[PDB]
Nucleic acid binder design. Structure first.
Ligand SMILES: Nc1ccn([C@H]2CC[C@@H](COP(=O)(O)OP(=O)(O)OP(=O)(O)O)O2)c(=O)n1
Ligand SMILES: [Ca+2]
Ligand SMILES: [Ca+2]
Ligand SMILES: [Ca+2]
Ligand SMILES: [Ca+2]
Length: 341
DNA sequence: GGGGGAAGGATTCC
DNA sequence: ACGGAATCCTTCCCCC
């Protein structure tokens, strides 16, 4: 089995540089403004020009401007990136319809069939890395190896606009040297917790007692890692479908006033149905970020699809439910629809 | 003891 | 106490 991973480089930002080529070479920073007050928001993604000066995804738009006050700060236009993504996906979709669109800018391509060998598989990378650059002028890094997890690791190592192959030997070198913190799906929180238990390499997960792990990071997350250190991972490249769609918005001011919130909540839903588009959801989650940034949410699953009229109706109840089991004032409020029909 | 699921909390950027 | 979209995942639950 041979898996080929593709990752669009600084995607949201690069897309913008493609829509306005006057930025290429300039620090471009795609942001998300909450409108709570000018420059209130966070950085979604930056290009390498911004990044090399300390501007990364997640920091407040304010602190980002203190570093690079003269960079091009642009608002998020997910929709645009979405269509661009689709096109690139269908583009890839023609090298193995046994692909997995992991995210708006990640995709795992099973090239087991289409080509056997680490030489011809690599040359399928440029055959693809060149076409995407040609057909849509987008630079995409390629990762290639035995399973999704290492192909993914390969790309993170070669970026941007690069390519790398992690054969069966390297996989072995990494499991003993790769920083646990660099493993796909291991966030800051999970990495830290691993420092404690005494883990810093994928291999260390073999010393500790499964039971200890299972308690600090969970069975699943636990099995995942052990599985990796054993080169005994292998998980198929499968279709995968967005399993939820939603919208959370920051209210102009905080509150605990049901009637002051409604409009935002009702805007979240209406704006969530547009993005649903025909798909029918049977589960709804009214979500609310607290005054202290804690995500509290209450949902409900029905034995049928949820008509929008019903969303309005139920979204309120769930909201009234929240206010009951909490104290904090609500800052951001939104909805989430799932369990599609 | 454990299936099948809903619900709520937590974490990754998938 | 500066944003947002999703998913992961650990517990509660009805009941065989
Ligand atoms: N705090 C964060 C961190 C990340 N993201 C988004 C940014 C786009 C998406 C994927 O990010 P990466 O995989 O890190 O890629 P990138 O940042 O878009 O750029 P590159 O692929 O070149 O690393 O996650 C976000 O919204 N909020
Ligand atoms: Ca990317
Ligand atoms: Ca990515
Ligand atoms: Ca990490
Ligand atoms: Ca990443």
């Amino acid at each position: 089995m041979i898996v080929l991973f593709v990752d669009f480089d600084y995607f949201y930002a690069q897309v913008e540089e493609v829509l306005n080529p006057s930025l290429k070479g300039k620090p471009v920073v795609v942001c998300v403004f909450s409108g709570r007050f000018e420059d209130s928001g966070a950085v979604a993604t930056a290009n390498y020009e911004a990044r090399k000066f300390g501007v990364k995804a997640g920091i407040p738009i304010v602190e980002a401007k203190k570093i690079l006050p003269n960079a091009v700060y642009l608002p998020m236009r997910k929709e645009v990136y979405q269509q661009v993504s689709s096109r690139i996906m269908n583009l890839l979709r023609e090298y193995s319809e046994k692909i997995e669109i992991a995210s708006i800018d990640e995709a795992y391509l099973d090239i087991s069939d289409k080509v056997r060998d680490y030489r011809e598989a690599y040359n399928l990378g440029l055959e693809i890395k060149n076409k995407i650059l040609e057909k849509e002028k987008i630079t995409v890094t390629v990762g290639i190896s035995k399973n999704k997890v290492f192909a993914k690791i390969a790309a993170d190592m070669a970026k941007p606009n690069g390519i790398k192959v992690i054969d069966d030997e390297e996989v072995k070198r990494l499991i003993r040297e790769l920083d646990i913190a660099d493993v796909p799906g291991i966030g800051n929180i999970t990495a830290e917790k691993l420092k404690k238990l005494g883990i810093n390499k994928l291999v260390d997960t073999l010393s500790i007692e499964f039971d200890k792990l299972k308690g600090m990071i969970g069975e699943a997350k636990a099995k995942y890692l052990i599985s990796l250190a054993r080169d005994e991972y292998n998980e198929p490249i499968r279709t995968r479908v967005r399993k939820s769609i939603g919208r959370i918005v920051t209210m102009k001011r905080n509150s605990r006033n049901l009637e002051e919130i409604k409009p935002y909540l009702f805007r979240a839903i209406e704006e969530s149905y547009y993005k649903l588009d025909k798909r029918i959801p049977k589960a709804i989650h009214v979500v609310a970020v607290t005054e202290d940034l804690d995500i509290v949410s209450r949902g409900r699953t029905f034995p049928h699809g949820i008509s929008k009229e019903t969303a309005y109706s139920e979204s309120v109840k769930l909201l009234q439910k929240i206010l009951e089991e909490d104290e904090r004032k609500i800052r951001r409020i939104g909805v989430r629809f799932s369990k599609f029909i």
